[PDB]
E3 ubiquitin-protein ligase RGLG1
Amino acid sequence: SKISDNYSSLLQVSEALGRAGLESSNLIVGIDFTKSNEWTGAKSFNRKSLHHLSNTPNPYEQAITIIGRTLAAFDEDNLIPCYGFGDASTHDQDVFSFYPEGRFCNGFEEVLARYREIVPQLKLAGPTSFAPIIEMAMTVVEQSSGQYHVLVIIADGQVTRSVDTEHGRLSPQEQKTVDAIVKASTLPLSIVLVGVGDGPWDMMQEFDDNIPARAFDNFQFVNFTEIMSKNKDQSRKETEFALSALMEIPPQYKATIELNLLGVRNGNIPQRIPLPPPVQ
Ligand SMILES: [Ca+2]
Ligand SMILES: [Ca+2]
Ligand SMILES: [Ca+2]
Ligand SMILES: [Mg+2]
């Protein structure tokens, strides 16, 4: 069933996790390197590309940074597998690992550094689909034998569609993304979409709230731009981010126990191989 916003403060989330008795969790990060990032910073990033490097941190650097300051404790060994998708080497079919032999980033400081080192070497492309990043996460979970994971996807939310959809019919990219979300729910995996840039966010909100075929609500949408836009203190910004990102985690974690997913091998999860980073 659909999971609502049941907590009005970070403290309530923490207590809910306390009651549920969470003992162990790990993070997975996926980063959208599709071409739409060049134009979804029109209003929110002064007509620059969301991936543009300079003296000001771009929204991806900001999200990675805030994620590291607020969610780091939810990765138990501070080793974070990072993947990119949607550049010219992966299109809508594959992901690549941040490092050549699948070596994990040691801390989000290194996630941020490696991001900076990689992104100007990429050809931003497409089409845009979340199926490969989610399928990657599924393989990480299956290979750990059903250890609980949270996949954090940082993206601009522009999954490929036709503007004159006729009407409510999904693109292949949307349909494959939905199928991946539905299949993911046979595994102990939480997904958090951190939306950067201008939106629009209709489809992310649909992933969040309305996929009847899945076994539990396994997908939360965080509007990162709207949180950072609020004329409000920086510590209150990060607290509001943490709250939004963790909002569904206590019920999702509980669902993995009640649906007998936690610690169990599914047996029907194809092994996705990440491509090497297309870099020097
Ligand atoms: Ca880890
Ligand atoms: Ca949801
Ligand atoms: Ca939600
Ligand atoms: Mg795109």
About this structure: Strands lie at 26-32, 79-80, 82-85, 96-97, 105-106, 149-155, 189-195, 219-223. The first helix runs from residue 10 to 20. Residues 34, 36, 126, 128, 158 surround magnesium ion (ligand 4) (CB under 6 Å). The chain has one domain: 10-157+170-258.
